[PDB]
């Protein structure tokens, strides 16, 4: 549900395991999230 | 084009993808959007 | 790494939606506020 | 000319040869296969 | 293998990114994601 929407922005801590998880993921749902997160990387990926 | 060595090679290659379900996996990746909620979402009906 | 001292999992943190209470005039809700008038204008009308 | 061995077609993997109507096409006993012959991956390599 | 395609949602559409891309990485959607699978199977290089 969270991948198939653009109303709620979503990210994770940058330089963390969760960012590293979706970066090297090959699940079709989870690749959509990193396709989302990499575009507006300045906005949704917080520092802590 | 009208006579090519790539017609039969793609005809093999398309049939390989649909028995692996990958033509169905790619269609669900793009055509599935917001979910588009149904008319059975009543949740309240004050009689008027 | 050593061998783990705590088990993890990536998950989604998000706000709870507010459970707005059914306030104490809740039983007037199954009819529209003009229908309550229309019943009241009926029993003030049919009695006349 | 209805098919002799009553099958459609399958490659018996050990002694690998076709049967049914697929064997009627490869051996040129037939010229057409106007029948419920479903287009699959492993059939379209050996017949057209 | 110069591939002629046309921009239509959700088949072929430009990729949204903070940095403007150049070449085949400009395009995303269904049909180029099909064509990356056709290029993997048949083993050819393509220029959109
Ligand atoms: C079958 C019998 C019919 C009789 C005909 C008469 C019908 C005439 C009625 C006409 C309309 C009355 C109801 C208004 C419509 C409701 C919708 C609304 O928005 O109101 C809301 C405001 O709360 C109110 O202001 C309600 C009105 C208070 C007076 C209630 C008198 C009871 C009727 C006397 C009859 C007894 C004597 C009968 C004869 C001896 C109520 O909803 P709420 O809960 O406040 O939601 C917000 C809560 N929150 C803020 C926390 C989120
Ligand atoms: C012959 C034919 C007739 C001739 C024509 C005559 C002309 C008549 C024409 C009328 C036209 C209609 C005008 C009114 C419209 C109201 C609807 C509405 O939205 O407002 C509100 C109604 O909620 C109430 O507050 C209702 C008032 C209290 C209910 C008790 C009344 C009856 C009591 C018992 C009766 C005893 C029965 C005895 C039987 C013998 C609902 O919204 P709200 O959110 O609650 O708003 C809060 C407002 N407030 C802040 C001020 C509280
Ligand atoms: C629960 O969440 C918030 C908290 O009240 C409500 O939405 C916000 O409400 C504040 C005022 O309290 C407004 O300033 C914001 O603009 C509201 N934001 C949004 C997105 O609505 C919300 O309505 C509450 N209730 C529910 C059912 O979610
Ligand atoms: C006997 C009397 C006093 C009862 C109360 C008045 C009656 C006659 C009036 C008050 C409001 C009126 C309604 C107001 C709105 C509509 C919607 C319209 O699309 C059809 C008529 C209808 C449904 C009316 C029917 C008659 C009605 C119910
Ligand atoms: O037996 S372990 O190798 N070391 C101890 N722990 C835990 C403290 C929870 C866990 C937790 C999950 C495991 F899969 C293994 C272990
Ligand atoms: N706790 C994570 C970083 C935060 C995250 O990736 O969610 C880690 O140990 O790398």
Interface size A-C, in CB pairs within 8 Å, comes to: 6
Residue with token string 């009906």: B45
Tell me how far the alpha carbon of residue A20 lies from the centroid of ligand 6, in angstroms: 9
The H or E element containing residue B6 is none
CB-CB contact of A15 with A3 (8 Å): no
Spatial separation of the C-alpha atoms in residues A10 and E20, rounded to whole Å:
23
How many angstroms separate the most distant Cα atoms in chain B? 69
- Per the CB < 8 A criterion, the answer to whether B10 and E42 are in contact is yes
DSSP structural state of residue E42? H
What torsion, rounded to 10 degrees, do the Cα atoms B2, B4, B6, B12 define?
80
Give the other-Cβ count within 10 Å of D35's Cβ.
Answer: 12
The CA dihedral of A11, A17, A22, A27, to the nearest 10 degrees, is -130
φ, ψ of residue E29 to 5 degrees: the values are: 130, -155
Look at ligand 1, atom 22, and give the residue with the nearest C-alpha: C25
Q: Are E48 and E4 in contact (CB under 8 A)?
A: no
Resolution value, angstrom units:
6.7
Q: CB D32: neighbour CB atoms within 10 A?
A: 9
Q: By the CB < 8 Å criterion, does B46 face chain C?
A: yes
Nearest CA to ligand 1 atom 37: C40
Phi-psi region of C12 (alpha: psi -120 to 50; beta: other; left: phi over 0): beta
Closest CA to D46 of D10, D14, D15, D13: D10
Instruction: Name the closest residue on chain B to residue A31, using Cα atoms.
Output: B29
Q: How do beta strands E27-29 and E12-14 pair?
A: antiparallel
| H/E segment holding residue E14 | strand E12-14
Say if CB E31 and CB B27 are below 8 A apart. no
CB-based burial label for D41 (10 Å; 0-12, 13-18, 19+): middle
- CA B17/CA C40 separation, integer angstroms: 69
Q: Is B12 on the interface with C (CB under 8 A)?
A: no
Distance (Å, whole) CA E28 – CA B29:
12
């Amino acid at each position: 549900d969270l991948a198939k929407q653009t109303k709620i922005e979503y990210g994770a801590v940058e330089d963390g395991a969760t960012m590293t998880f979706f970066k090297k993921s090959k699940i079709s749902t989870y690749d959509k999230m990193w396709a989302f997160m990499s575009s507006r990387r300045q906005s949704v990926l917080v520092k802590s | 084009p009208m006579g090519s060595p790539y017609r039969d090679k793609i005809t093999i290659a398309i049939l390989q993808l649909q028995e692996e379900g990958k033509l169905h996996m790619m269609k669900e990746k793009w055509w599935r959007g917001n979910g588009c909620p149904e008319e059975e979402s009543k949740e309240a009906s004050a009689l008027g | 790494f050593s061998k783990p001292f705590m088990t993890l999992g990536i998950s989604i943190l998000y706000r709870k939606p507010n459970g707005t209470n059914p306030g104490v005039f809740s039983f007037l809700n199954p009819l529209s506020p003009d229908i309550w008038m229309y019943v009241l204008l009926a029993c003030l009308g049919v009695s006349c | 000319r209805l098919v002799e061995d009553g099958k459609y077609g399958a490659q018996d993997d050990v002694n690998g040869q076709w049967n049914g109507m697929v064997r009627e096409l490869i051996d040129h006993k037939a010229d057409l296969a106007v029948a419920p012959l479903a287009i699959t991956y492993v059939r379209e390599k050996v017949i057209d | 293998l110069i591939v002629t395609t046309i921009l239509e949602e959700p088949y072929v559409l430009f990729k949204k990114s903070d940095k403007p891309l150049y070449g085949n990485d400009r395009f995303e959607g269904y049909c180029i994601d099909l064509l990356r699978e056709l290029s993997t199977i048949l083993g050819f290089t393509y220029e959109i």
